[PDB]
């Protein structure tokens, strides 16, 4: 669905510049922010 | 219509005739098909149309009488041939292998004993090239050669 994602401006690969790839994967259960991911 | 009776006395009588249905949706059209908006929307199945344009014993009616354009008339002729071969006209008959979309006369094709290379392959024709411009209602075109 790359052309549709480009038509909505949301990259073409869903692993590109969105919240699904750029938000942190996890956090401590108490609520502390995790260290930033390397990628 | 008109009939001729032989008893030796032969006489011609005029019988009742059908008329065109009252209001065509496109009155500016030139042949009966164009008028009734049927330019590319009829197949070999449409015997309720082919029956209107055939003779009682299976033959076609001539163009100067049906009013059909040459394109339509040839398309109707091929559709009627294919309907007769498929067996969809059981009461328009002269004087077991089930078929459909039969282009050629079944007694006049020879078997493909030597199919060629996959680049010059003897294909089997299916349907009629005259109905290429029929409406697809699909995203792959018609396959005229199998």
């Amino acid at each position: 669905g790359g052309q549709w994602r480009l038509q909505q401006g949301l990259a073409a690969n869903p692993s590109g510049y969105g919240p699904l790839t750029e938000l942190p994967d996890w956090s401590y259960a108490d609520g502390r922010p995790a260290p930033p991911m390397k990628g | 219509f008109r009939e001729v009776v032989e008893t030796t006395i032969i006489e011609g009588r005029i019988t009742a005739t059908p008329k065109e249905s009252p209001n065509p949706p496109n009155p500016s059209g030139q042949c009966p098909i164009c008028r009734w908006n049927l330019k590319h929307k009829y197949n070999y199945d449409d015997v309720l149309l082919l029956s209107q344009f055939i003779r009682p014993h299976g033959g076609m009616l001539p163009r100067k009488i049906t009013g059909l354009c040459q394109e339509e008339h040839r398309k109707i002729e091929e559709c009627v041939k294919m309907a007769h071969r498929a067996g969809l006209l059981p009461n328009h008959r002269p004087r077991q292998l089930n078929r459909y979309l039969t282009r050629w006369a079944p007694g006049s094709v020879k078997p493909i004993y030597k199919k060629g290379p996959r680049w010059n392959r003897v294909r089997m024709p299916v349907g009629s090239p005259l109905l290429r411009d029929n409406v697809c209602y699909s995203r792959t075109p018609w396959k005229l050669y199998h």
Partner: protein, 38 residues
């Protein structure tokens, strides 16, 4: 009949007829004009 790629009517009585999937020239007055399509 004679096998021919181009069929030609050699009389006014020659008639072109397509039978058995092939065109043919038949003549009932001059049968030497019989021709078979190849």
């Amino acid at each position: 009949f004679k096998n021919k790629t181009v069929l030609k009517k050699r009389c006014k009585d020659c008639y072109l007829v397509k039978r058995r999937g092939r065109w043919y020239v038949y003549c009932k007055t001059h049968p030497r004009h019989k021709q078979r399509q190849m």
